[PDB]
Amino acid sequence: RPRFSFSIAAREGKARTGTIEMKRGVIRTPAFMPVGTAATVKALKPETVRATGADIILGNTYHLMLRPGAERIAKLGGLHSFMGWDRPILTDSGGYQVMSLSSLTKQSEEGVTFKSRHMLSPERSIEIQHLLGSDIVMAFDECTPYPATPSRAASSMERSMRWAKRSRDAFDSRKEQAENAALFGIQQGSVFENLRQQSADALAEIGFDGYAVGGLAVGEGQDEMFRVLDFSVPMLPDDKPHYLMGVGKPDDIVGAVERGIDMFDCVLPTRSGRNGQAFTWDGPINIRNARFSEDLKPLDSECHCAVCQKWSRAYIHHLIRAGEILGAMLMTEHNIAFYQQLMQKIRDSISEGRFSQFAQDFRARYFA
Amino acid sequence: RPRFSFSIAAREGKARTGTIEMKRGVIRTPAFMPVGTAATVKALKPETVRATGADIILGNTYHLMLRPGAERIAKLGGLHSFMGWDRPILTDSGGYQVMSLSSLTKQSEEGVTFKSRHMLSPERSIEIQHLLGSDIVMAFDECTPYPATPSRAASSMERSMRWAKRSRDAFDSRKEQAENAALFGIQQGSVFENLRQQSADALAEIGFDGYAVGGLAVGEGQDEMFRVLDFSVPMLPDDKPHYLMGVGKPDDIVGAVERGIDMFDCVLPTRSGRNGQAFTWDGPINIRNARFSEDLKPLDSECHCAVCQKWSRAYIHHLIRAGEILGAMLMTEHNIAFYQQLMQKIRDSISEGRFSQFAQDFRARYFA
Numbered sequence: 001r002p003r004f005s006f007s008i009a010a011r012e013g014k015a016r017t018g019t020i021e022m023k024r025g026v027i028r029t030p031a032f033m034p035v036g037t038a039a040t041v042k043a044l045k046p047e048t049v050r051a052t053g054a055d056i057i058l059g060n061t062y063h064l065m066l067r068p069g070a071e072r073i074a075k076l077g078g079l080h081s082f083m084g085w086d087r088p089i090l091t092d093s094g095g096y097q098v099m100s101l102s103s104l105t106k107q108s109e110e111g112v113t114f115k116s117r118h119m120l121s122p123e124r125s126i127e128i129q130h131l132l133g134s135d136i137v138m139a140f141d142e143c144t145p146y147p148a149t150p151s152r153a154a155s156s157m158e159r160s161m162r163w164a165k166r167s168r169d170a171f172d173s174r175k176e177q178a179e180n181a182a183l184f185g186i187q188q189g190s191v192f193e194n195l196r197q198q199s200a201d202a203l204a205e206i207g208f209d210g211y212a213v214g215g216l217a218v219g220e221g222q223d224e225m226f227r228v229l230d231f232s233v234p235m236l237p238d239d240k241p242h243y244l245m246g247v248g249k250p251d252d253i254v255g256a257v258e259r260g261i262d263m264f265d266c267v268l269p270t271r272s273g274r275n276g277q278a279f280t281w282d283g284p285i286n287i288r289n290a291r292f293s294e295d296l297k298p299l300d301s302e303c304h305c306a307v308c309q310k311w312s313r314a315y316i317h318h319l320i321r322a323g324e325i326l327g328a329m330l331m332t333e334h335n336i337a338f339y340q341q342l343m344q345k346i347r348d349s350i351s352e353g354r355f356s357q358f359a360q361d362f363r364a365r366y367f368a
Numbered sequence: 369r370p371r372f373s374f375s376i377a378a379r380e381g382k383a384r385t386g387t388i389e390m391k392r393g394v395i396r397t398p399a400f401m402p403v404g405t406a407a408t409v410k411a412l413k414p415e416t417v418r419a420t421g422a423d424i425i426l427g428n429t430y431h432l433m434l435r436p437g438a439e440r441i442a443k444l445g446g447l448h449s450f451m452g453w454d455r456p457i458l459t460d461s462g463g464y465q466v467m468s469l470s471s472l473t474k475q476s477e478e479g480v481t482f483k484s485r486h487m488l489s490p491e492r493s494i495e496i497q498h499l500l501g502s503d504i505v506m507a508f509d510e511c512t513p514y515p516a517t518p519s520r521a522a523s524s525m526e527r528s529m530r531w532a533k534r535s536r537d538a539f540d541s542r543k544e545q546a547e548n549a550a551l552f553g554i555q556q557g558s559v560f561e562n563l564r565q566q567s568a569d570a571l572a573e574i575g576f577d578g579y580a581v582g583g584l585a586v587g588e589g590q591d592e593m594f595r596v597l598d599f600s601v602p603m604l605p606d607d608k609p610h611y612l613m614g615v616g617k618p619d620d621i622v623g624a625v626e627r628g629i630d631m632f633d634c635v636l637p638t639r640s641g642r643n644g645q646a647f648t649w650d651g652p653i654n655i656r657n658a659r660f661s662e663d664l665k666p667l668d669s670e671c672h673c674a675v676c677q678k679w680s681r682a683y684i685h686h687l688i689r690a691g692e693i694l695g696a697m698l699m700t701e702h703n704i705a706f707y708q709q710l711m712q713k714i715r716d717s718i719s720e721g722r723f724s725q726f727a728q729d730f731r732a733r734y735f736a
């Protein structure tokens with residue numbers, strides 16, 4: 001198996017479908033990555049994550065470096081062995097989470113020091129991801145807060161680009177990592193076209209295996225996110241994967257694919273599952289609602305998941321009302337399966353040249 | 369398949385091993401029943417409960433009548449369909465739980481009224497268990513508090529015996545229930561030999577499919593519980609199953625089998641699993657302890673369960689420390705599997721006439 005090979009099998013407008021081949025497996029694109037921040041996709045065994053159709057999951061440098069620790073995970077045989085997931089794992093670099101979750105931060109050209117006292121930098125981030133045994137390593141960046149003035153966005157993006165080069169160099173210096181893993185760069189520039197262009201130029205000059213659109217899904221809303229994607233995605237190399245970080249709701253995913261995105265991750269299906277929200281083709285439902293107390297239908301009428309084959313809305317309603325762990329388990333498995341089925345329909349429709357019609361049909365029903 | 373047929377295949381001293389055949393499946397005895405109070409064995413899919421080796425699970429009249437409701441479960445197709453467990457279910461009658469969990473109770477010859485305002489009586493308890501579709505129905509009784517004076521124990525036991533007859537009559541009046549389910553009586557009498565005898569006599573005169581030893585595991589401790597079992601179990605009909613309610617720790621189970629008990633239920637493996645206690649052949653361990661943070665061994669070195677085949681102590685330690693649902697799932701599956709393996713070893717050793725040696729070996733190692 002190759003270290004990293006991206007093939008585009010079909011296109012429709014800006015949308016693409018294909019595969020990334022890696023040593024630990026094949027990733028079908030457009031891809032959705034379930035989030036496994038604490039070395040677990042919450043409430044699911046890895047075998048169940050795979051059963052839903054997931055090809056790859058997301059982990060986090062920031063969380064794992066704090067608990068259980070990067071050196072510790074390496075001593076225990078690496079993240080794959082530790083959590084029992086043998087397929088590809090993409091790890092975020094800490095760039096976002098250090099600023100989102102830390103009680104106090106000190107930012108400088110060297111990197112970021114923070115209180116959980118720890119340090120992250122391009123070099124340390126890449127080293128941690130090496131110790132974890134990540135398959136797709138993210139460059140260490142800064143997710144510019146929204147909104148930002150053009151000047152603040154510019155200085156932030158420029159620092160990220162210097163950090164991108166340091167990330168590239170650190171990754172390339174570690175022979176085993178360079179041989180077995182892939183490195184993605186992260187575009188910044190807030191909502192500004194000229195900065196997005198400068199960022200894309202800088203990343204392409206360095207050269208990466210894939211390119212993430214960073215700095216979005218940070219409160220700007222779908223209209224603005226789509227506006228920025230409209231000009232930002234075409235700036236990235238066409239022949240490499242495009243990864244939209246932290247997106248999103250089903251309609252966000254469809255629109256982002258229409259704009260050239262190949263990869264997604266989001267806590268929504270897992271988190272909202274635990275909170276009682278189930279995704280269906282007719283839009284989300286809250287299973288806690290009294291209207292479901294005697295509803296014998298599955299969560300979704302078409303869904304092929306094991307939950308929908310076996311249990312009723314009424315039962316899951318009871319479980320979630322009761323605070324039962326099995327409620328969280330079943331809701332989560334269903335939601336992750338729903339997300340994977342969405343990605344499968346997207347892939348199939350692009351392959352068949354009917355993605356535009358799929359997007360239209362999807363929205364008409366989902367938002368009816 | 370028969371409604372109810374108990375066969376004893378082998379004996380050693382007071383210990384027996386055999387099978388109960390019922391319409392929904394065979395129960396190997398001595399049997400351990402995982403507890404499923406809220407219509408779920410906490411943190412496990414029914415398929416996982418079955419995978420551990422369980423033949424039958426326990427449900428509760430008291431909890432289910434309050435949430436989601438007995439009529440509601442019947443409208444939804446019965447408890448088996450509702451929760452997705454198609455094998456036998458034994459339901460406790462509410463006799464214990466109404467007094468243990470209710471905020472206020474009023475006790476009379478008719479039954480018990482309580483605040484969650486509801487009513488339980490022999491007739492209502494049997495009706496609820498009918499609506500649930502229970503396979504083994506428990507008589508509605510009173511679990512005498514411990515300690516009790518001989519006179520208080522006597523009056524309590526006598527009321528339970530009158531309630532046992534009312535339970536028998538209510539069950540027999542419902543043709544579908546009498547055709548498809550079994551009814552067990554519950555012996556009371558606290559710690560007093562003469563009262564236990566009077567209770568056994570009363571139950572045998574009425575006639576039941578099985579006989580539970582009630583009124584124990586209520587704070588008396590193992591020495592006293594065993595002392596009472598020594599004289600109480602031989603009073604019950606030899607040719608019917610003997611069920612010790614609410615027991616217990618592994619050593620309690622072994623000693624109770626040595627005293628003629630065929631059936632057990634306890635929340636210990638599930639509850640203590642969630643709390644970080646794992647059962648092993650060398651005694652329980654608390655997986656949260658720092659000593660496990662880098663321990664690559666499975667929870668137990670011999671255990672055949674899926675958890676022990678795949679994950680380390682170190683990983684489970686991390687999960688439980690982090691409050692992750694998967695931690696609860698894995699600990700629970702392992703503990704329930706451990707309990708089932710204990711029952712299998714008990715069954716095999718009695719079958720082979722080496723149970724005494726097994727009990728000795730078990731204790732020497734478990735308590736080393």
Ligand SMILES: Nc1nc(=O)c2cc3nc(NCCN4CCCCC4)[nH]c3cc2[nH]1
Nearest residue numbers: 093095096143214215216217245246267268
């Ligand atoms: N290294 C790095 N750089 C980014 O610019 C970035 C940008 C991101 N934007 C998000 N948004 C997450 C949105 N999420 C939606 C569901 C509820 C929780 C928040 N996650 C991100 C992660 C990111 N990681």
Ligand SMILES: Nc1nc(=O)c2cc3nc(NCCN4CCCCC4)[nH]c3cc2[nH]1
Nearest residue numbers: 461463464511582583584585613614635636
């Ligand atoms: N109907 C009925 N009658 C009883 O005499 C009875 C006696 C019981 N004794 C227990 N003890 C439960 C012990 N358990 C150990 C693990 C922690 C929680 C308490 N459960 C019982 C249930 C019972 N149910």
Ligand SMILES: [Cl-]
Nearest residue numbers: 246265266267
């Ligand atoms: Cl997210």
Ligand SMILES: [Cl-]
Nearest residue numbers: 614633634635
């Ligand atoms: Cl118990």
Ligand SMILES: [Zn+2]
Nearest residue numbers: 303305308334
């Ligand atoms: Zn489903």
Ligand SMILES: [Zn+2]
Nearest residue numbers: 671673676702
């Ligand atoms: Zn095990």
